[PDB]
Swiss-Prot record:
Record bears the keyword Hydrolase: no
Induction pattern: Detected in log-phase B.subtilis cells (at protein level).
Variant or mutagenesis effect after changing W11M: No changes in biotinylation in E.coli
Residue ranges of domain Biotinyl-binding in the record: 1-68
PROSITE patterns: BIOTINYL_LIPOYL
Modified residues (N6-biotinyllysine): K34
Origin: domain of life: Bacteria
Effect of Q20H: In strain: ATCC 6633
InterPro entries referenced in this protein's UniProt entry, alphabetically: Biotin_Carboxyl_Carrier/Decarb, Biotin_lipoyl, Single_hybrid_motif
Protein known as: Biotin/lipoyl attachment protein
Pfam families the UniProt entry points to: Biotin_lipoyl (PF00364)
Key words of the record: Biotin, Lipoyl
Length: 72
């Protein structure tokens, strides 16, 4: 999994299931603190699933996406 790390609203999301991410690649944007903050892949992988959408509420530790198992 990869998760949000602050309270806010998930401004936009750029992944989809079957997409590729790499550690530090942009994955979403979070709006909070009257600012916008990029959200990145904490690790590389294929996006197995996405758990959020644009404009949804999000929190510190709230899941953003899930990735391929190491066997893949």
């Amino acid at each position: 999994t990869v998760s949000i790390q602050m309270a806010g609203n998930l401004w936009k999301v750029h992944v989809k299931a079957g997409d590729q991410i790499e550690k530090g690649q942009e994955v979403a944007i979070l709006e909070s603190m009257k600012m916008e903050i990029p959200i990145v892949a904490d690790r590389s992988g294929i996006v197995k699933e996405v758990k959020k959408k644009e404009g949804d509420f999000v929190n510190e530790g709230d899941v953003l996406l899930e990735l391929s198992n190491s066997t893949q």
